[PDB]
Design an enzyme around this catalytic site. Structure first.
Site, PDB file in Angstrom:
ATOM      1  N   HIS B  40      29.143  25.351  46.611  1.00  8.66           N
ATOM      2  CA  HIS B  40      29.017  24.921  45.588  1.00  8.66           C
ATOM      3  C   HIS B  40      28.634  26.711  45.007  1.00  8.66           C
ATOM      4  O   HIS B  40      28.726  26.365  43.715  1.00  8.66           O
ATOM      5  CB  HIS B  40      27.912  23.826  45.087  1.00  8.66           C
ATOM      6  CG  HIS B  40      26.891  24.528  45.854  1.00  8.66           C
ATOM      7  ND1 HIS B  40      26.608  23.503  46.226  1.00  8.66           N
ATOM      8  CD2 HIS B  40      25.763  24.266  45.254  1.00  8.66           C
ATOM      9  CE1 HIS B  40      25.197  23.657  46.566  1.00  8.66           C
ATOM     10  NE2 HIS B  40      24.671  23.933  45.973  1.00  8.66           N
ATOM     11  N   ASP B  84      31.098  20.371  51.245  1.00 10.42           N
ATOM     12  CA  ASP B  84      30.734  21.376  50.700  1.00 10.42           C
ATOM     13  C   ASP B  84      30.020  22.206  51.829  1.00 10.42           C
ATOM     14  O   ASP B  84      28.934  22.505  51.806  1.00 10.42           O
ATOM     15  CB  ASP B  84      28.745  20.453  49.919  1.00 10.42           C
ATOM     16  CG  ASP B  84      27.991  21.984  48.916  1.00 10.42           C
ATOM     17  OD1 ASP B  84      28.954  22.686  48.654  1.00 10.42           O
ATOM     18  OD2 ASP B  84      27.404  21.701  48.662  1.00 10.42           O
ATOM     19  N   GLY B 175      17.439  27.271  44.467  1.00  9.98           N
ATOM     20  CA  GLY B 175      17.608  27.936  44.668  1.00  9.98           C
ATOM     21  C   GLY B 175      17.711  28.431  46.766  1.00  9.98           C
ATOM     22  O   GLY B 175      17.965  28.941  47.026  1.00  9.98           O
ATOM     23  N   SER B 177      20.012  26.194  48.899  1.00 11.45           N
ATOM     24  CA  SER B 177      21.232  25.651  48.072  1.00 11.45           C
ATOM     25  C   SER B 177      21.814  27.187  49.101  1.00 11.45           C
ATOM     26  O   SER B 177      21.636  28.033  48.729  1.00 11.45           O
ATOM     27  CB  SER B 177      22.375  25.683  47.245  1.00 11.45           C
ATOM     28  OG  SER B 177      21.902  24.557  46.489  1.00 11.45           O
ATOM     29  N   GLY B 178      23.043  26.135  50.576  1.00 17.18           N
ATOM     30  CA  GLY B 178      23.286  26.849  51.057  1.00 17.18           C
ATOM     31  C   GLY B 178      22.730  27.838  52.195  1.00 17.18           C
ATOM     32  O   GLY B 178      23.302  28.411  53.181  1.00 17.18           O
TER      33      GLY B 178
END
Ligand SMILES: [Ca+2]
Ligand SMILES: [N+]
Ligand code: NA
Ligand code: NA
Ligand code: NA
Lengths: 13, 223
Positions: B40, B84, B175, B177-178
């Protein structure tokens, strides 16, 4: 509520 | 990261910032030319920033390298958030050093209760917003599948796990995420989603990297 943790968030109802 | 601590400069040397004129997501360096992040977090115009502490000051140790490939999992479902995961290939290899280092992929999945390190430049408040300059860290346990599913009925796929807490106050947030969830030296998770941040009974949800190790290897080998 249910949201991804990105900037900006992507949210779901 | 809500309820965490300042990591200290370059103490998480596999943590990257994805930048598009601002920090928008984290990632994890897995070899000199590849980063793992969340599907995402895909966009055009990604610059990977390695070696960062203060994302708003050029301090030394930074390497800024453009993405040359951004590879979202082909079966990523943007409504359920299943699969994801994204791989980013760097336009040139990073220069590896004590401050810019890869993190190992899992050899097996982690058990409930294992302590992990979650890190990022996301919001530090559970109500409102405060974005930190320097990298934040949180120690957090993996939750059981049955508790994760109790918290988020009908939403936790086999490619997700929960980590954190149920009493509130400690979580990843917007912020983050990932970015990484690292547990005994292995990248077990990718920051993905949750109901708010640091809310009671609503732990963070993370992509289960151990399910993707073969896919990662096959994708890197072919690219
Ligand atoms: Ca910097
Ligand atoms: N739970
Ligand atoms: Na963005
Ligand atoms: Na709460
Ligand atoms: Na393989």
């Amino acid at each position: 509520g249910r949201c991804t943790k990105s900037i900006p968030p992507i949210c779901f109802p | 990261i809500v309820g965490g601590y300042t990591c200290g400069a370059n103490t998480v040397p596999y943590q990257v910032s994805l930048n598009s004129g601002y920090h928008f997501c984290g990632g994890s360096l897995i070899n000199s030319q590849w980063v793992v992040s969340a599907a995402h977090c895909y966009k055009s115009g990604i610059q990977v920033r390695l070696g960062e502490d203060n994302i708003n000051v050029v301090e030394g140790n930074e390497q800024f390298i453009s993405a040359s490939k951004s590879i979202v999992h082909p079966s990523y479902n943007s409504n359920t958030l299943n699969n994801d995961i994204m791989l980013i290939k760097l336009k040139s290899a990073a220069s590896l050093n004590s401050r810019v280092a890869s993190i190992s992929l899992p050899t097996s999945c982690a058990s409930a209760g294992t302590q992990c390190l979650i890190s990022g430049w996301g919001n530090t408040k559970s109500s409102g917003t405060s974005y930190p300059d320097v990298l934040k860290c949180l120690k957090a346990p993996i939750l059981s599948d049955s508790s994760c599913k109790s918290a988020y009925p009908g939403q936790i796929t086999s490619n997700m796990f929960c980590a954190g807490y149920l009493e509130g106050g400690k979580d990843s947030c917007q912020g983050d995420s990932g970015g990484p969830v690292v547990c005994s030296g292995k990248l077990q998770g990718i920051v993905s989603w949750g109901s708010g941040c640091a809310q009671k009974n609503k732990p963070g949800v993370y992509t289960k990297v151990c399910n993707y190790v073969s896919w990662i290897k096959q994708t890197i080998a072919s690219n």
